Amino acid sequence: REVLTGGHSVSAPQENRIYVMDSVFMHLTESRVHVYDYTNGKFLGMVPTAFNGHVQVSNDGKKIYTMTTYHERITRGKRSDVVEVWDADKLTFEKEISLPPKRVQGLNYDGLFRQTTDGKFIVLQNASPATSIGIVDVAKGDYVEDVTAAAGCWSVIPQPNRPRSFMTICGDGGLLTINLGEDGKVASQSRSKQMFSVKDDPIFIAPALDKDKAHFVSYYGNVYSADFSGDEVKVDGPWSLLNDEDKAKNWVPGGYNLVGLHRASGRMYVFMHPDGKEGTHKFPAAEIWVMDTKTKQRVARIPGRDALSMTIDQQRNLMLTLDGGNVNVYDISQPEPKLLRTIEGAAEASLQVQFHPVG
């Protein structure tokens, strides 16, 4: 009379979809990606990601990539670090790509698991605990390169204006730019001038990323810029997020994936909190500040609802916000963000949400 079937695809169109990376820290070997419809908050499915999984969507929007660690017997036996390719509509596993056993195990910053702008290479952070950047060639389904030049550096910022270039933040306060050949090996590299003082004004690793420049906020609320319109990165800063009346309450940035850039408008979003002092750099947002990057001035401020991480959709003018368990959907088509809805229970321990690529 009725029969149960599998083989089905996600009910909602890809343009409705977001990916909540649930670390499940209390049970970190059962991390997973929760797929939601941002328009109505409906749960659409999930991808299992074992121990401390990381996730991104292929730039063409056809696949989900995960990165994770298995062991033969979980808590004992042989380690396998892998990237997995999953079909975006079927949410089925397709392909496993072997990594050396040193992929980063850590909280879900965007910059630990990325891709080249052309979509041809997965670009990931290694730590053994020596750091290097790993390159995976998607068409080949193989690990093709270990960027040991990136030693003493951390995290991956892709250049949206180049097919296969990305930068990383280095312990000298500068950026290292890697340009890959078509085979995913380093073709060229360049190192910037010191952008920030590591000791005096450390930056959060999360970039507010433009087509041809990246903005970075600091522990004390300063702003640094890296311009890569040219082959050599030009660095500037700092300028202050704080006007004179902000300074009394010691407003500083806090969070994880804490900034975002709306490319068309030049608006940068930052999670902020008052009473900043040593050790408050991961505090939940009391407020979201919206800054014009051109004029270097705040244009809006709203309540932060304890958010820690965000992401921006350029095409639909949306910001997602995430306090660890709940996702807020904001309309950012105007300088002041409007709250559209809150998805409650989207995760138990998530520090990362992402849109399905559209356009």
Binding site: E2, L4, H8, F43, G45, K90
Partner: protein
């Protein structure tokens, strides 16, 4: 009657443990997990076996045989957990028993979610 097609019902009513046909459900309702009452969420697989029982339909006044299949091979959905026990019996009446994993014979036995399949009068 409309009572017999969960696809036609209000979601909030179908996604409740009190929904007339969910009367011996142990686990997460698939209809809250990306699927429907009769479809596995994407990337999860129907169990060829299940526990079974009968449920009373308060709407048309009749009793129905339900087959409680699981969907398998992904980690726990975690949403809409039910533990109803109408006419459930211990493992010496094994196919009336819901304290076992009905994914046990699937290619991957990891339990994802469970549902309520209408067999008939």
């Amino acid at each position: 009657h409309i009572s017999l097609n969960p696809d036609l019902a209000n979601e909030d009513e179908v996604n409740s443990c009190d929904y007339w046909r969910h009367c011996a459900v142990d686990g997460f309702l698939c209809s809250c997990c990306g699927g429907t009452t009769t479809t596995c969420p994407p990337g999860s697989t129907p169990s060829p076996i299940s526990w079974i029982g009968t449920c009373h339909n308060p709407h048309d006044g009749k009793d129905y045989l339900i087959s409680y299949h699981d969907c398998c091979g992904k980690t726990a959905c975690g949403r809409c957990q039910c533990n109803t026990q109408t006419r459930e019996r211990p493992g010496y009446e094994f196919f009336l028993h819901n304290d076992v994993n009905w994914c046990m014979a699937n290619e991957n036995s990891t339990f994802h979610c469970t549902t309520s399949v209408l067999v008939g009068l």
